[PDB]
Design a protein around this nucleic acid. Structure first.
Ligand SMILES: [Mg+2]
Ligand SMILES: [Mg+2]
Ligand SMILES: [Mg+2]
Ligand SMILES: [Mg+2]
Ligand SMILES: [Mg+2]
Lengths: 197, 191, 171, 72, 137, 234
RNA sequence: UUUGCUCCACACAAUAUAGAUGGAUACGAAUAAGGCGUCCUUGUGGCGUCGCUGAACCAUAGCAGGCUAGCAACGGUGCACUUGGCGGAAAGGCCUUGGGUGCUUGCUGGCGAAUUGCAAUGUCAUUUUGCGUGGGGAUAAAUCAUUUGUAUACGACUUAGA
RNA sequence: GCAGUCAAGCGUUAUAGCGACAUUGCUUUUUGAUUCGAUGUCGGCUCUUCCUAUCAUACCGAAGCAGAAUUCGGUAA
RNA sequence: AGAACUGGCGAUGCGGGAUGAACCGAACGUAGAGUUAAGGUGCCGGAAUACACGCUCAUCAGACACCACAAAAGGUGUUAGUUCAUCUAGACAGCCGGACGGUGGCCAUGGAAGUCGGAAUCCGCUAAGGAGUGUGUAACAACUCACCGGCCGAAUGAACUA
RNA sequence: GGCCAGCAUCAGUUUUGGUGGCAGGAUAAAUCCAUAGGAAUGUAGCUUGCCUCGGUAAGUAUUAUAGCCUGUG
């Protein structure tokens, strides 16, 4: 219902998130994904590292610059999963993929925007407790990504600023609720309560 | 089989306080405090009184109940560590080259320094883990003592000291030099 | 499908000087009367030397549960077709109806034994009168006095693609 | 950490058709052997059933009645 | 302050006397009582006050409410109705914000266009009063 | 799967079944009718040669051992199940390793024999220490200083792991001889002993404690009464 | 290269094509746990309350929203200025001081609407490599050709020359 | 390979018939003595990559492995 | 491999099985509407991230042709069954105690005492105790278990089947 | 009168809702009421052991100050 839907990628399962995002893009929804380094894949870390090393094995023999390109970033891994589900060699597929942005962390201006979740792709709702799962940032660092520390530091600074903003917002919200509660006995409030508001 | 409910009991002596919140166990006794993170296992803790704490698994299987018994043992070990302590005595023996064991300070890190093992010129260094104390026994020849409230830390430190003196490329039936854990017990000897 | 229980009573066709042939009655669990009569003729041919073209169906009547809203324990004696021969099996199902217990047993045989409807033969379904005669632990654990258990990690179904709050699994 | 080559699981049409022919030949040979071989060709009440005594009493009563049913 | 402390994490328990709310089926939105436990996934419920038939139901079709009243195991419909009336489950349910939220949702769904216009006018008046009050403090 | 696997041993002796218990039951109930006095004896940690010597001394009588529950069931658990009148007291007075002595001899003679019977025995755990034992410094000998070292044979080298690990004694092997750096005190006289100290004393062969049979009570067939003896129950 | 180049306000003008048509409405973490409120001896603290979806919240009446008369209150809100602070991950945005200038549907009135003919998206939202008006702001470089050889098949590279 | 033996199973109420693991005889006898018909496709030079079923190099385990040396085995291209 | 008979294909497009000579549906004028077959309904991709009961975690599972590798072999993975047994005159584990006497049985050996070997392998007392299950000694000693008992108190073991 | 449409009443085919009257079965089984028996996953009451002023641990007790099951109508 929003012109742009921003999805916080933390705690999501990569395949189901890719499926829902690809369907939304093909239907014509603009989507931005943040915090791709906090994505999850079901299964053990060595299983997913083995799968990525099989992908690393895949390469064109007579010229390595022509073969499959192995992008190491978590957002790029998610983009690979999404492009595998979008028919990207057609104009419609390209137009759908150009409605998507994926980022590590939460860069501006999305650090001051509302961020949503997709319940059908959340790990805590989908995976059975006791099942093992992998963190995409750790997998990317193991397979060659080199920016996990900088992302962590920037995210910590952003969290400090966001916590200050939320403290101010909570104080204002408590003041607003107190000001609204003192008019609960008025005739206007009684009529609104009778009408359901 | 999916048993409906399986529970274990943990007995707390008089001088020990246990605080658990979101599977973070803090155990306080006369000898100090210990902390454990058990968030990798789905269990439910409950207090019935100041002397007993139950831990339970609802609708679980064989692996889940095995983890439940493991959790009970770990909390019992923490309580034992804060109320009695743990003491590992090791002996180092040699045939021809005397093993020299000392405590050295490299940038305030408290290494155990081993020299002249089988005549080696290499200086072996084993760091002391936080919370354990190293003492050279009096009126006992070639005995080291590791004391602490964490049985895991004390045992791992003793194992590291034992494995730093492996014999390589020699018949171990003939060559008997090394550092071996000789006794395990409690620090307190009240009775 | 949703099983029903029928009684099927049949006999041989009356011949000369042999009138009133003996009536035979069987209790059949089946989805409909056509399947019930087919199973009846199959079992009658398997046990006696009576064929469908040589016999007739005298009656077929649906039998309803006496107390469908009472929780009961059922011992189910069954046997299944195998290469070595018929092998007995005893199961215990806690349910409110014989047809519900039979459906649960068929689902369990499909899930565990990889068995089918025409391979599973239902020999006896008997209500256990006294709780002391229950001898399977997965049934006995629900006979405990004042049994209470929680339902941890509640997962709520979402009707929308996107949610504006982090979900909670409390209950 | 050198991952080996993984065996393919994509179905081959020629292999599938050859397996079909091999299976038909195997079934024909099994039928022929079952016709050609010369080899000689009731578990009762389960012990876990509660009313074993009732079943045994009923079958004894049926035997006792049917022994005299055909005699007189 | 030398006492052990353990968090409780209170759960609603599947038990005889637990009051459940039916969320799908023929009796959706109605209250019932758990009469007897069948197994881990199914229970026996009876809803005589609201017209819910006594039936075996799956726990995935109901939601547990915090309300619970004393009821013997395997109680018949008359006993369940008598205990329900004695314990006054309906009044305690209506006193809760959950049922109040359901009632507010139903009233808003039942509003008409003129009533929505009246709601807007009353909301503007209340907003003027609330903003004037909040400006001072 | 994932279960413990039982150890299998190929020996000559099989386990006893219910037939042995039934035989003991029948023998006790026949001896009750045959004899006149039934005495209750406590014989915990008795040696078999000592028990056989007692059996030889009490020729003409019967001594029956076995499970305490089986003996009590033979004597009658309660008043409505007793084999003879007022036998439930004799049944309920039994405890531990209990022996039944069926005899006809004089009560004074039985009491005199059981009061004057005494044998040397190993010191058991949970008992007062009979002496103070100190293994002397140097080469460890078989007796550990009880007899002179010139007469004694040195301790065999195969027992050094047992003394080092099970007995928790600091020992070393020098030229195939067990040696200790300092004298080792094992027990102090007038102290409760534990399993380790009892094992050390048994290994060195010190037998300073005394074994005395305990006599609980006796039952008379004609009198149909039970009288407490209270012998060696100190 | 018949005053070229660039922004600042005001007119006229055309323009808004992977798809505006009330608002993308900002803690973090856990999920066998949390959010909010309150109190103390500030904690892994006590007490209360909430969830069971955003079916929300905020906004939303006036010729696509006109012209006027008041009442109550000192609130809400638009715009041009103005004071101060913060924000570098792609900051280009967030908060805030003061006066000015409009509206206010918080409440009560008075005028106007019609014929787009019984519907026809019935056109309504930022930017403008176009012009005219004008007050200010600044007066380069590259390539060919010649030349060097740290370069070179040719292009290219690397040097030098008012 | 051929012929035979045993029996955990399989089969049966007719000790018929199949039959794992084991085992015997011939080939092959005792004192470490004393080249026999490829009937039709082969090998180089230069140079790259791949497999591991590992010869060497790295790290381990076992062995009458004292040391030295060596044998068997494991991870490993 | 050789006979008998019957189907499909060549001369035949259409839907499905990703792709295809014999596989599953169905045979064909040009169109509209409806319903289906076979095959399917996370996304590519039209259609339930439907409902319900169970099972499974694989250091390259599986989503397959039902043939082979395949010995229905191996596994202290998991689930459900079958038949035998033990059991409050005491279930499995654990700890402690007993584990004897003739006798160091005969022969043999430098030595050989249950435990280097060869043949017997008995009798007594027991609650039970092998002319000994292993470690160990030059031989002894010592430990152990075969077996019995004490404490503990409720179910447990074995072999098969899926 | 040529082009493109809107509404109403019909006809042919079809798709998707709401609502009414009947009939069969064990003339549904149930629920409910009445009545006679019964037992525990034993309700009230009673006894003992000793337990934070009575909350329990084990015996008795078949409806009592809760209930349940079966047969019959
Ligand atoms: Mg107007
Ligand atoms: Mg290899
Ligand atoms: Mg689709
Ligand atoms: Mg192969
Ligand atoms: Mg029509």
């Amino acid at each position: 219902v929003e012109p742009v839907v921003v999805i916080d990628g933390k705690g999501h399962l990569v395949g189901r998130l890719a499926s829902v995002v690809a369907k939304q893009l093909l239907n014509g929804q603009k989507i931005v994904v943040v915090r791709a380094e906090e994505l999850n894949i079901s299964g053990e870390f060595f299983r997913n590292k083995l799968k990525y090393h099989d992908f690393l094995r895949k390469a064109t023999a007579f010229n390595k610059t022509r073969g499959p390109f192995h992008f190491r970033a978590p957002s790029r891994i998610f983009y690979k999963a999404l492009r595998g589900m979008v028919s990207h060699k057609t104009a419609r597929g390209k137009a759908a993929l150009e409605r998507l942005k994926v980022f590590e962390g939460i860069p501006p201006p999305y650090d001051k925007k509302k961020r949503v979740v997709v319940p059908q792709a959340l790990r805590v709702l989908r995976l059975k407790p006791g099942r093992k799962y992998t963190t995409l940032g750790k997998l990317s660092t193991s397979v060659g990504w080199k920016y996990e520390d900088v992302v962590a530091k920037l995210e910590a600074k952003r969290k400090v600023s966001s916590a200050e903003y939320y403290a101010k917002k909570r104080a204002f919200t408590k003041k607003v609720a107190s000001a609204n509660a003192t008019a609960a006995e008025s005739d206007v409030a009684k009529q609104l309560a009778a009408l359901g508001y | 089989m999916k048993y409906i409910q399986t529970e274990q009991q943990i007995e707390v002596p008089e001088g020990v306080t246990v605080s658990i919140k979101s599977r973070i166990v803090k155990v306080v006794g006369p000898r100090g405090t210990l902390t454990k993170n058990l968030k990798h296992i789905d269990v439910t803790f409950t207090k019935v009184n100041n002397q007993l704490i139950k831990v339970a698994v609802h609708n679980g299987g064989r692996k889940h109940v095995a983890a439940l018994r493991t959790v009970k043992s770990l909390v019992d070990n923490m309580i034992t560590g804060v109320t009695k302590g743990y003491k590992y005595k090791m002996r180092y023996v040699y045939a021809h080259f005397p093993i020299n064991v000392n405590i050295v300070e490299k940038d305030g890190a408290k290494f155990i320094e081993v020299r002249n093992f089988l005549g080696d010129k290499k200086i072996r260094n084993v760091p002391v883990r936080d919370g354990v104390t190293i003492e050279f026994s009096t009126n006992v020849k070639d005995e080291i003592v590791l004391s602490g409230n964490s049985v895991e830390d004390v045992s791992q430190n003793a194992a590291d000291l034992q494995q730093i003196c492996r014999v390589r490329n020699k018949d171990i039936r003939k060559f008997l030099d090394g550092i071996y854990v000789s006794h395990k017990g409690f620090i307190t000897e009240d009775l | 499908a949703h099983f029903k229980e029928y009684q099927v009573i049949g006999r041989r066709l009356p011949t000369e000087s042999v009138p009133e042939p003996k009536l035979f009655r069987m209790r059949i669990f089946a989805s409909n009367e056509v399947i019930a009569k087919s199973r009846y003729w199959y079992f009658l041919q398997k046990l006696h030397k009576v064929k469908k073209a040589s016999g007739e169906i005298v009656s077929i009547n649906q039998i309803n549960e006496a107390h469908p809203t009472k929780v009961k324990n059922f011992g189910v004696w069954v046997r299944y077709d195998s290469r070595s021969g018929t092998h007995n099996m005893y199961k215990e199902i806690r349910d409110v109806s014989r047809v519900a217990a039979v459906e649960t047993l068929y689902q369990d045989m499909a899930a565990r034994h990889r068995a089918r409807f025409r391979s599973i033969h239902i020999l006896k379904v008997a209500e256990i009168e006294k709780t002391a005669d229950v001898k399977r632990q997965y049934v006995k654990q629900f006979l405990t006095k004042d049994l209470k258990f929680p339902l941890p990690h509640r997962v709520q179904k979402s009707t929308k693609t996107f949610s504006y709050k982090r979900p909670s699994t409390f209950y | 950490m050198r991952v080996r080559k993984r065996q393919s699981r994509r179905t081959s049409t020629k292999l599938k058709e050859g397996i079909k022919k091999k299976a038909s030949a195997h079934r024909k040979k099994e039928k022929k052997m079952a016709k050609k071989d010369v080899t000689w060709r009731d578990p009762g009440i389960p012990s876990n059933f509660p009313y074993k005594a009732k079943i045994l009493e009923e079958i004894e009563a049926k035997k006792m009645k049917d022994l005299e049913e055909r005699e007189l | 302050s030398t006492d052990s402390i353990v968090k409780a994490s209170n759960w609603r328990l599947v038990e005889v006397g637990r009051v459940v709310l039916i969320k799908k089926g023929q009796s959706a939105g109605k209250l019932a009582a758990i009469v007897e436990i069948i197994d881990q996934k199914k229970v026996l419920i009876d809803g005589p006050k609201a017209g819910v038939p006594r039936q075996a139901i799956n726990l995935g079709q109901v939601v547990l409410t915090p309300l619970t009243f004393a009821l013997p195991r395997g109680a018949r419909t008359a006993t369940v109705s008598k205990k329900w009336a004695a314990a006054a489950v309906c009044e305690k349910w209506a006193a809760s914000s959950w049922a109040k939220k359901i009632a507010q949702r139903e009233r808003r769904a039942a509003l008409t266009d003129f009533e929505r216009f009246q709601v807007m006018v009353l909301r503007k008046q209340k907003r003027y009063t609330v903003k004037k009050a909040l400006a001072k403090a | 799967r994932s279960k413990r696997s039982k150890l299998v041993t190929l020996a000559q002796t099989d386990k006893k079944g219910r037939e042995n218990k039934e035989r003991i039951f029948d023998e006790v109930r026949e001896a009750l009718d045959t004899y006149r006095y039934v005495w209750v004896l406590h014989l915990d940690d008795v040696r078999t040669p000592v028990l056989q010597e007692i059996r030889t001394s009490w020729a003409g009588s019967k001594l029956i051992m076995g499970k305490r529950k089986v003996l009590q069931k033979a004597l009658g658990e309660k008043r409505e199940e007793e084999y003879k009148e007022n036998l439930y007291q004799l049944s309920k007075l039994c405890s531990g390793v209990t022996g039944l002595l069926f005899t006809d001899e004089d009560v004074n003679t039985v009491k005199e024999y059981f009061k004057s019977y005494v044998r040397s025995d190993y010191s058991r755990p949970n008992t007062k220490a009979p002496l103070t034992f100190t293994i002397p410094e140097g080469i460890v000998y078989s007796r550990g200083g009880q007899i002179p070292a010139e007469e004694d044979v040195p301790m065999i080298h195969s027992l050094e792991p047992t003394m080092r690990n099970k007995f928790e004694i600091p020992t070393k092997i020098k030229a195939g001889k067990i040696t200790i750096d300092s004298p080792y005190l094992v027990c102090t006289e007038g102290e409760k002993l534990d399993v380790r100290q009892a094992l050390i004393l048994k290994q060195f062969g010190i037998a300073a404690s005394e074994f005395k049979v305990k006599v609980s009570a006796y039952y008379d067939n004609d009198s149909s009464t039970v009288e407490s003896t209270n012998i060696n129950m100190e």
